[PDB]
Amino acid sequence: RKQVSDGVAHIHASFNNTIVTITDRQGNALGWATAGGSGFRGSRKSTPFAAQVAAERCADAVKEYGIKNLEVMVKGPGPGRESTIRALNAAGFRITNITDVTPIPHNGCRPPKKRR
Amino acid sequence: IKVRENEPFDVALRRFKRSCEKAGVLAEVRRREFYEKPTTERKRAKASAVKRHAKKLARENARRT
Amino acid sequence: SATIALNKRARHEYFIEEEFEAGLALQGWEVKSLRAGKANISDSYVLLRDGEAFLFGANITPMAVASTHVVCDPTRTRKLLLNQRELDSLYGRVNREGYTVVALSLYWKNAWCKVKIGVAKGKKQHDKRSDIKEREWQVDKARIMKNAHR
RNA sequence: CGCGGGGUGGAGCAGCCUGGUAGCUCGUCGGGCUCAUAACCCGAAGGUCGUCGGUUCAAAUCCGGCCCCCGCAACCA
RNA sequence: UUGAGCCUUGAUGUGUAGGAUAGGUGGGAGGCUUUGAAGUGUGGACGCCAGUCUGCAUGGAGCCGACCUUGAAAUACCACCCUUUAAUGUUUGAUGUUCUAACGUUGACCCGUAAUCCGGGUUGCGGACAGUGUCUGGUGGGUAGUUUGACUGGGGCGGUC
RNA sequence: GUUUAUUAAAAACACAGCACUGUGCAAACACGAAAGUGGACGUAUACGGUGUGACGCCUGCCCGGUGCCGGAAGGUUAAUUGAUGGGGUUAGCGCAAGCGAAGCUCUUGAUCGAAGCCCCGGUAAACGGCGGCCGUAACUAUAACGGUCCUAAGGUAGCGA
RNA sequence: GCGGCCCCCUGGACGAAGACUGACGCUCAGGUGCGAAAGCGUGGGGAGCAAACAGGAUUAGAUACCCUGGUAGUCCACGCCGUAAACGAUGUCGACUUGGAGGUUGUGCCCUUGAGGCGUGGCUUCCGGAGCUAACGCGUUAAGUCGACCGCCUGGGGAGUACGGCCGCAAGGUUAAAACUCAAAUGAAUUGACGGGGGCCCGCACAAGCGGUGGAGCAUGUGGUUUAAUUCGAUGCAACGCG
């Protein structure tokens, strides 16, 4: 399990679900535990409290790897990005750095026209 | 956007995440390019914005405020 | 299952309150045509006089012809096998100028024709606009509600 | 023709083996739940383990059978 | 590398009693200890996490066996070693790579010779593949040899044997 | 233009054109046991096969079946490998039967195993396919319509004795 | 209509003082050229988006909105198509006619003598006097006041269609009626009404609590049925122990 005290928190938030996973410094993932991975399948899949449980569900089950510090990367908007960081503050992990890595294109790809 | 907020912060308060937009182009790039409605919707909103400051000049009446 | 053609359009036109599972008596050519043989159910109502509750609007024609000598008409007022408990109460709450008994669906109960019948009430068109508005009102309400979480 | 295994709650899957102190969930009902239902949450239920014998302190386990599901190459009366 | 095979070796297994991670069968009451003990700080092993295994050094020189409640008994000591994990060496396939040296060149050089034939070496690029032989599954109207009955108011069809 | 030399000269073939598909060069393919050739002393604006047939407007829906292409998990899966299981003969025992060592044989088939098919998808200028029932309009009539049966879809544009 | 930056070629605009030509001016039927997007032809390319198409939902039905794919197209180059609510719905040019509040780009003077002060031009926004108008509004870039010229209008529907012409590969484009029908169609403003338009208010209206109906027996009234009669009237809310 490499006993890696360091950690990297790749948090991908969407408007329907929150993707919570912890990878190493090189980005190889340890494990993923999402809001759809802790019940709440359907209406309640976009909730910061459901993102809170998903932040807890990935906080544990990686305890074999022995992580105490992490740098936080947040991608995409959604119910997360303002509550899982509070969950990670209360998870016991060191909040070393919070970096917003939401990708902003320079209007290269044309968006669709849905939801009329 | 990228900040450690020093060592003993214990709370994010990352105002630079919301300083740029945090949802502006993050919702602008979602859908409805439309190629002329952003031209249209920036006309009347700026028309309303000038009118809001034009109707801000309605204090000159007595009004018994 | 063994369901036959159903009057789904009656729900748009009528707002039926209470239902029944009364059985229907039918002739020998009707049973063969009932499983398959193009049975229709539109504009189904009743013509009670004393105990003569008849499924009125039911167009079922013989697919394979099994008619000889005497006549055989595809549309008939088929006699319904109604319970006596369900019979005396229809001297009351069906005679109210708008109240009627319609058949929502047709099916089988172990090779017996049991027809799901219900006491319709009938919508005027001024409240028909409200219900179509209400169905769109329920959908668009959560669309506003979901925008708080975007 | 004789080679490969498994048969267990209503259901589909494990514990058996590396012996003793049979569960899980699907379908059920019990409740919550609710302008209304439901999403979803829990409460409960069920086969002595295909059958019959033996070994064994101890057989659902292991071994003898028998039966069933099959899979298989055979298939020149 | 990856697994298997076995050598060596520890680890490895509390129906219920019960202080016991006591396996079975079994030979056994002295093993053993200062060629440094009871029992420490614990590491790690560990596990039905009950509690042992347990490196080292302080500790420093005693502990357990029949003995005891147990169906049973004591790893005090072991034998066959079952069980279970890894190391060790060993025979093997399978996979990944490197190399050139078999093998390929209808890449290049010159030579036989003046001859894109062919052969000689030089040399390059491939390279133990490819391709060939034997065996073998699959495909195969591309091709070959043949079959497709009789009765019957002619025959076909139907019907029959 | 070509053709049934010698009963059929055309509504046939060919044709320009379009499309599909294959082929990266020692090409596919073809002749050929094989050397080697054609392709081609050409190499994707090239060559082979197929479908249609100037041109103009165009060419719809359907992948169940068959065929082709792709996928690799699993099921089945030859040769090999022979583990195991059975027998024969018999050194010897049984002074009777009966047994049985070693060896050599016959027999058994686990283990090894790709392609293939089963499976998962794509493919119709791949082969081909493209339906029905009754009820319904304030003259009769007629159904725009609604319900129904099955299919992968139910023949679109256009045309039609 | 045109924007990541760079380079290459090229048009126009405006500012300054002078020099110069000496009415070369304005406008325009025809004609000529350009002209969004979609589309057509040809050779390409194709991430994403996306008609059509297919599937999934919704509905009574949904060949739509929604959801999942997805071709043409979008993209490059060569030509074609000359059509848009191609509109500030206001043609082109000159002149004259209260202002105020902004932006952009010049240029001149004085004090840059402290993010300056004052002039003078172009382009241009908003509000507005006179005036105009049917009103809304327009308003020194007029819809005010005139002058020059061209295009066009003549009730609504038929009808921008028919036939004919020419242009076009096609789609189509331009030119342009008649028969017949109707007594209205239309533009602005106004009062109410409604709004699945917005903002505020209050009420047992909801919430919040507590008691009931609807289940049961009898009592009363209505409908329905019967009768010789079971008089008649009251029957959304605002009838149904009402007259």
PDB file of N, CA, C and O (backbone and C1' of nucleotides) in Angstrom, chain F residues 26-47:
ATOM      1  P     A F  26       9.363  -4.599 -53.090  1.00  0.00           P
ATOM      2  O5'   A F  26       9.558  -5.665 -54.255  1.00  0.00           O
ATOM      3  C5'   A F  26      10.028  -6.973 -53.961  1.00  0.00           C
ATOM      4  C4'   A F  26       9.025  -8.041 -54.321  1.00  0.00           C
ATOM      5  C3'   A F  26       7.712  -7.975 -53.552  1.00  0.00           C
ATOM      6  O3'   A F  26       6.670  -8.547 -54.342  1.00  0.00           O
ATOM      7  C1'   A F  26       8.837  -9.972 -53.002  1.00  0.00           C
ATOM      8  P     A F  27       5.492  -7.628 -54.938  1.00  0.00           P
ATOM      9  O5'   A F  27       4.692  -7.137 -53.651  1.00  0.00           O
ATOM     10  C5'   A F  27       4.059  -8.069 -52.790  1.00  0.00           C
ATOM     11  C4'   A F  27       2.718  -7.570 -52.319  1.00  0.00           C
ATOM     12  C3'   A F  27       1.518  -8.363 -52.806  1.00  0.00           C
ATOM     13  O3'   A F  27       1.265  -9.506 -52.010  1.00  0.00           O
ATOM     14  C1'   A F  27       1.129  -6.059 -53.145  1.00  0.00           C
ATOM     15  P     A F  28       0.650 -10.831 -52.672  1.00  0.00           P
ATOM     16  O5'   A F  28      -0.903 -10.513 -52.789  1.00  0.00           O
ATOM     17  C5'   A F  28      -1.667 -10.180 -51.641  1.00  0.00           C
ATOM     18  C4'   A F  28      -2.982  -9.569 -52.041  1.00  0.00           C
ATOM     19  C3'   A F  28      -3.782 -10.365 -53.056  1.00  0.00           C
ATOM     20  O3'   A F  28      -4.542 -11.398 -52.460  1.00  0.00           O
ATOM     21  C1'   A F  28      -3.654  -8.120 -53.757  1.00  0.00           C
ATOM     22  P     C F  29      -4.190 -12.936 -52.754  1.00  0.00           P
ATOM     23  O5'   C F  29      -4.764 -13.188 -54.218  1.00  0.00           O
ATOM     24  C5'   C F  29      -6.079 -12.784 -54.566  1.00  0.00           C
ATOM     25  C4'   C F  29      -6.169 -12.455 -56.032  1.00  0.00           C
ATOM     26  C3'   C F  29      -5.751 -13.569 -56.973  1.00  0.00           C
ATOM     27  O3'   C F  29      -6.775 -14.525 -57.181  1.00  0.00           O
ATOM     28  C1'   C F  29      -4.723 -11.549 -57.640  1.00  0.00           C
ATOM     29  P     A F  30      -6.407 -16.083 -57.290  1.00  0.00           P
ATOM     30  O5'   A F  30      -5.809 -16.221 -58.755  1.00  0.00           O
ATOM     31  C5'   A F  30      -6.594 -15.861 -59.876  1.00  0.00           C
ATOM     32  C4'   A F  30      -5.760 -15.715 -61.120  1.00  0.00           C
ATOM     33  C3'   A F  30      -4.863 -16.890 -61.457  1.00  0.00           C
ATOM     34  O3'   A F  30      -5.561 -17.948 -62.086  1.00  0.00           O
ATOM     35  C1'   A F  30      -3.649 -14.877 -61.678  1.00  0.00           C
ATOM     36  P     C F  31      -5.099 -19.466 -61.850  1.00  0.00           P
ATOM     37  O5'   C F  31      -3.866 -19.640 -62.838  1.00  0.00           O
ATOM     38  C5'   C F  31      -4.017 -19.394 -64.227  1.00  0.00           C
ATOM     39  C4'   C F  31      -2.696 -19.477 -64.944  1.00  0.00           C
ATOM     40  C3'   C F  31      -1.830 -20.672 -64.596  1.00  0.00           C
ATOM     41  O3'   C F  31      -2.244 -21.872 -65.222  1.00  0.00           O
ATOM     42  C1'   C F  31      -0.504 -18.722 -64.603  1.00  0.00           C
ATOM     43  P     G F  32      -2.582 -23.159 -64.321  1.00  0.00           P
ATOM     44  O5'   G F  32      -1.187 -23.529 -63.650  1.00  0.00           O
ATOM     45  C5'   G F  32      -0.115 -23.991 -64.452  1.00  0.00           C
ATOM     46  C4'   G F  32       1.230 -23.738 -63.818  1.00  0.00           C
ATOM     47  C3'   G F  32       1.567 -24.550 -62.585  1.00  0.00           C
ATOM     48  O3'   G F  32       1.927 -25.893 -62.861  1.00  0.00           O
ATOM     49  C1'   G F  32       2.209 -22.315 -62.241  1.00  0.00           C
ATOM     50  P     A F  33       1.166 -27.108 -62.127  1.00  0.00           P
ATOM     51  O5'   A F  33       1.408 -26.864 -60.567  1.00  0.00           O
ATOM     52  C5'   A F  33       2.725 -26.826 -60.026  1.00  0.00           C
ATOM     53  C4'   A F  33       2.758 -27.134 -58.553  1.00  0.00           C
ATOM     54  C3'   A F  33       4.060 -26.743 -57.865  1.00  0.00           C
ATOM     55  O3'   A F  33       3.807 -26.429 -56.497  1.00  0.00           O
ATOM     56  C1'   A F  33       3.799 -29.089 -57.776  1.00  0.00           C
ATOM     57  P     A F  34       4.151 -24.968 -55.927  1.00  0.00           P
ATOM     58  O5'   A F  34       5.655 -24.716 -56.386  1.00  0.00           O
ATOM     59  C5'   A F  34       6.752 -25.223 -55.642  1.00  0.00           C
ATOM     60  C4'   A F  34       8.028 -25.097 -56.432  1.00  0.00           C
ATOM     61  C3'   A F  34       8.243 -23.733 -57.066  1.00  0.00           C
ATOM     62  O3'   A F  34       8.914 -22.844 -56.192  1.00  0.00           O
ATOM     63  C1'   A F  34       8.494 -25.425 -58.711  1.00  0.00           C
ATOM     64  P     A F  35       8.765 -21.257 -56.365  1.00  0.00           P
ATOM     65  O5'   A F  35       9.975 -20.863 -57.322  1.00  0.00           O
ATOM     66  C5'   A F  35      11.315 -21.179 -56.977  1.00  0.00           C
ATOM     67  C4'   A F  35      12.173 -21.296 -58.208  1.00  0.00           C
ATOM     68  C3'   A F  35      12.211 -20.062 -59.093  1.00  0.00           C
ATOM     69  O3'   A F  35      13.164 -19.104 -58.666  1.00  0.00           O
ATOM     70  C1'   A F  35      11.746 -21.964 -60.418  1.00  0.00           C
ATOM     71  P     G F  36      12.688 -17.672 -58.114  1.00  0.00           P
ATOM     72  O5'   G F  36      12.083 -16.943 -59.393  1.00  0.00           O
ATOM     73  C5'   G F  36      12.855 -16.782 -60.571  1.00  0.00           C
ATOM     74  C4'   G F  36      11.989 -16.858 -61.798  1.00  0.00           C
ATOM     75  C3'   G F  36      11.100 -15.654 -62.052  1.00  0.00           C
ATOM     76  O3'   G F  36      11.790 -14.597 -62.690  1.00  0.00           O
ATOM     77  C1'   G F  36       9.837 -17.636 -62.297  1.00  0.00           C
ATOM     78  P     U F  37      11.074 -13.176 -62.883  1.00  0.00           P
ATOM     79  O5'   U F  37      10.293 -13.318 -64.262  1.00  0.00           O
ATOM     80  C5'   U F  37       9.220 -12.448 -64.567  1.00  0.00           C
ATOM     81  C4'   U F  37       8.097 -13.165 -65.268  1.00  0.00           C
ATOM     82  C3'   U F  37       6.770 -12.431 -65.270  1.00  0.00           C
ATOM     83  O3'   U F  37       6.710 -11.421 -66.256  1.00  0.00           O
ATOM     84  C1'   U F  37       6.413 -14.683 -64.663  1.00  0.00           C
ATOM     85  P     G F  38       6.668  -9.879 -65.817  1.00  0.00           P
ATOM     86  O5'   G F  38       5.311  -9.359 -66.458  1.00  0.00           O
ATOM     87  C5'   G F  38       4.801  -9.961 -67.635  1.00  0.00           C
ATOM     88  C4'   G F  38       3.370 -10.390 -67.452  1.00  0.00           C
ATOM     89  C3'   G F  38       2.457  -9.364 -66.812  1.00  0.00           C
ATOM     90  O3'   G F  38       2.022  -8.371 -67.717  1.00  0.00           O
ATOM     91  C1'   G F  38       2.116 -11.452 -65.785  1.00  0.00           C
ATOM     92  P     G F  39       2.410  -6.838 -67.453  1.00  0.00           P
ATOM     93  O5'   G F  39       1.616  -6.472 -66.124  1.00  0.00           O
ATOM     94  C5'   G F  39       0.203  -6.383 -66.134  1.00  0.00           C
ATOM     95  C4'   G F  39      -0.369  -6.449 -64.743  1.00  0.00           C
ATOM     96  C3'   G F  39       0.041  -5.332 -63.799  1.00  0.00           C
ATOM     97  O3'   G F  39      -0.723  -4.156 -63.993  1.00  0.00           O
ATOM     98  C1'   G F  39       0.220  -7.419 -62.698  1.00  0.00           C
ATOM     99  P     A F  40      -0.005  -2.722 -64.062  1.00  0.00           P
ATOM    100  O5'   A F  40       1.239  -2.958 -65.024  1.00  0.00           O
ATOM    101  C5'   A F  40       2.179  -1.917 -65.268  1.00  0.00           C
ATOM    102  C4'   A F  40       3.607  -2.384 -65.101  1.00  0.00           C
ATOM    103  C3'   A F  40       3.957  -3.718 -65.757  1.00  0.00           C
ATOM    104  O3'   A F  40       5.297  -3.662 -66.238  1.00  0.00           O
ATOM    105  C1'   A F  40       4.441  -3.821 -63.454  1.00  0.00           C
ATOM    106  P     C F  41       5.611  -3.240 -67.754  1.00  0.00           P
ATOM    107  O5'   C F  41       7.030  -2.529 -67.648  1.00  0.00           O
ATOM    108  C5'   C F  41       7.187  -1.329 -66.907  1.00  0.00           C
ATOM    109  C4'   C F  41       7.884  -1.576 -65.593  1.00  0.00           C
ATOM    110  C3'   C F  41       8.458  -0.347 -64.905  1.00  0.00           C
ATOM    111  O3'   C F  41       7.484   0.369 -64.166  1.00  0.00           O
ATOM    112  C1'   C F  41      10.067  -2.088 -64.909  1.00  0.00           C
ATOM    113  P     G F  42       7.792   1.849 -63.626  1.00  0.00           P
ATOM    114  O5'   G F  42       6.360   2.410 -63.224  1.00  0.00           O
ATOM    115  C5'   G F  42       5.345   2.586 -64.200  1.00  0.00           C
ATOM    116  C4'   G F  42       3.997   2.193 -63.655  1.00  0.00           C
ATOM    117  C3'   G F  42       3.716   2.629 -62.225  1.00  0.00           C
ATOM    118  O3'   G F  42       3.272   3.970 -62.125  1.00  0.00           O
ATOM    119  C1'   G F  42       3.221   0.346 -62.438  1.00  0.00           C
ATOM    120  P     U F  43       3.438   4.769 -60.742  1.00  0.00           P
ATOM    121  O5'   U F  43       2.221   4.257 -59.854  1.00  0.00           O
ATOM    122  C5'   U F  43       2.131   4.592 -58.481  1.00  0.00           C
ATOM    123  C4'   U F  43       1.858   3.377 -57.635  1.00  0.00           C
ATOM    124  C3'   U F  43       2.195   3.517 -56.160  1.00  0.00           C
ATOM    125  O3'   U F  43       1.124   4.089 -55.432  1.00  0.00           O
ATOM    126  C1'   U F  43       3.052   1.460 -57.009  1.00  0.00           C
ATOM    127  P     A F  44       1.258   5.543 -54.771  1.00  0.00           P
ATOM    128  O5'   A F  44      -0.251   5.976 -54.504  1.00  0.00           O
ATOM    129  C5'   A F  44      -1.168   6.140 -55.583  1.00  0.00           C
ATOM    130  C4'   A F  44      -2.595   5.820 -55.194  1.00  0.00           C
ATOM    131  C3'   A F  44      -3.137   6.530 -53.952  1.00  0.00           C
ATOM    132  O3'   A F  44      -4.535   6.761 -54.119  1.00  0.00           O
ATOM    133  C1'   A F  44      -3.259   4.203 -53.640  1.00  0.00           C
ATOM    134  P     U F  45      -5.078   8.153 -54.710  1.00  0.00           P
ATOM    135  O5'   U F  45      -5.042   7.939 -56.285  1.00  0.00           O
ATOM    136  C5'   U F  45      -6.247   7.858 -57.040  1.00  0.00           C
ATOM    137  C4'   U F  45      -6.115   8.495 -58.404  1.00  0.00           C
ATOM    138  C3'   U F  45      -4.846   8.155 -59.187  1.00  0.00           C
ATOM    139  O3'   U F  45      -5.163   8.066 -60.574  1.00  0.00           O
ATOM    140  C1'   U F  45      -5.003  10.494 -58.910  1.00  0.00           C
ATOM    141  P     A F  46      -5.514   6.645 -61.230  1.00  0.00           P
ATOM    142  O5'   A F  46      -4.384   5.676 -60.670  1.00  0.00           O
ATOM    143  C5'   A F  46      -3.110   5.601 -61.291  1.00  0.00           C
ATOM    144  C4'   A F  46      -2.391   4.339 -60.899  1.00  0.00           C
ATOM    145  C3'   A F  46      -3.168   3.051 -61.117  1.00  0.00           C
ATOM    146  O3'   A F  46      -3.117   2.584 -62.452  1.00  0.00           O
ATOM    147  C1'   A F  46      -2.294   3.058 -58.937  1.00  0.00           C
ATOM    148  P     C F  47      -4.462   2.083 -63.177  1.00  0.00           P
ATOM    149  O5'   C F  47      -4.575   0.549 -62.766  1.00  0.00           O
ATOM    150  C5'   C F  47      -3.575  -0.380 -63.151  1.00  0.00           C
ATOM    151  C4'   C F  47      -3.509  -1.542 -62.196  1.00  0.00           C
ATOM    152  C3'   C F  47      -4.773  -2.374 -62.076  1.00  0.00           C
ATOM    153  O3'   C F  47      -4.944  -3.308 -63.125  1.00  0.00           O
ATOM    154  C1'   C F  47      -3.975  -1.865 -59.920  1.00  0.00           C
TER     155        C F  47
END
